[PDB]
Design a protein around this ligand. Structure first.
Ligand SMILES: CCCCCCCC/C=C/CCCCCCCC(=O)OC[C@@H](O)CO
Ligand SMILES: CCCCCCCC/C=C/CCCCCCCC(=O)OC[C@@H](O)CO
Ligand SMILES: CCCCCCCC/C=C/CCCCCCCC(=O)OC[C@@H](O)CO
Ligand SMILES: CCCCCCCC/C=C/CCCCCCCC(=O)OC[C@@H](O)CO
Ligand SMILES: CCCCCCCC/C=C/CCCCCCCC(=O)OC[C@@H](O)CO
Ligand SMILES: CCCCCCCC/C=C/CCCCCCCC(=O)OC[C@@H](O)CO
Ligand SMILES: CCCCCCCC/C=C/CCCCCCCC(=O)OC[C@@H](O)CO
Ligand SMILES: CCCCCCCC/C=C/CCCCCCCC(=O)OC[C@@H](O)CO
Ligand SMILES: [Ca+2]
Ligand SMILES: [Cl-]
Lengths: 25, 25, 25, 25
């Protein structure tokens, strides 16, 4: 388990990457 | 809970993203 | 130890960086 | 505490940001 803030950052970073890729596709 | 260094990195990454977005808005 | 989602994000971020560098080299 | 791989990713990400900023300064 992780600090909730670290969980939140991790979700944000993954979503960031997915959106960036979709934007380029 | 997380290593303090991981907490720090997570805060930095979120702030990074917020600043980048504000810069573009 | 970390939340599995944080582990996954960390692996993704490292791979992201490695691919970006290889792309530029 | 965190998974060592998460610690490593966090260090890499911070160093990444510091290098990127120094490169731009
Ligand atoms: C298109 C807009 C996209 C915006 C993405 C950037 C969003 C930035 C906002 C981040 C909010 C983080 C929410 C964080 C929510 C969890 C905070 C918490 O309760 O921490 C407690 C622990 O420390 C206890 O150990
Ligand atoms: C260019 C923008 C790219 C980012 C787009 C993101 C859009 C949606 C924003 C995502 C923020 C989701 C943060 C969600 C973070 C939830 C943290 C959590 O797990 O709650 C606490 C538990 O750990 C138990 O205490
Ligand atoms: C506009 C400038 C923006 C600069 C952003 C980049 C900043 C880079 C500096 C990072 C400082 C990280 C602070 C880290 C502070 C926590 C360190 C710690 O005590 O770790 C102990 C644990 O390992 C025990 O398990
Ligand atoms: C382009 C620059 C984008 C980044 C801008 C960032 C500006 C502000 C810098 C943020 C650094 C905040 C790091 C703060 C990290 C605090 C770590 C902590 O939580 O203390 C230890 C506890 O976990 C308990 O031991
Ligand atoms: C070239 C394409 C590259 C795509 C990279 C982006 C991929 C985005 C997808 C992310 C999938 C994340 C998998 C996450 C797998 C672990 C989820 C989990 O079981 O969490 C449980 C814990 O919360 C219990 O505490
Ligand atoms: C521009 C694309 C850059 C990203 C390319 C990534 C391509 C490959 C995708 C990587 C996703 C790997 C996620 C793998 C995450 C595994 C999480 C895990 O460790 O399982 C659970 C355990 O913690 C125990 O419960
Ligand atoms: C200028 C080049 C910059 C390259 C930056 C990218 C480097 C990519 C390489 C990453 C190596 C990660 C090292 C990771 C070292 C810790 C691995 C580990 O022992 O994990 C065990 C835990 O899972 C047990 O729970
Ligand atoms: C554009 C390149 C930007 C990245 C430049 C990075 C250059 C230096 C590379 C950094 C990799 C450092 C990874 C160091 C990761 C150490 C993980 C660790 O803490 O060991 C295990 C403990 O947690 C206890 O088991
Ligand atoms: Ca932990
Ligand atoms: Cl963690």
């Amino acid at each position: 388990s992780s600090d909730p803030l670290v969980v939140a950052a991790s979700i944000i970073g993954i979503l960031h990457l997915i959106l960036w890729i979709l934007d380029r596709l």
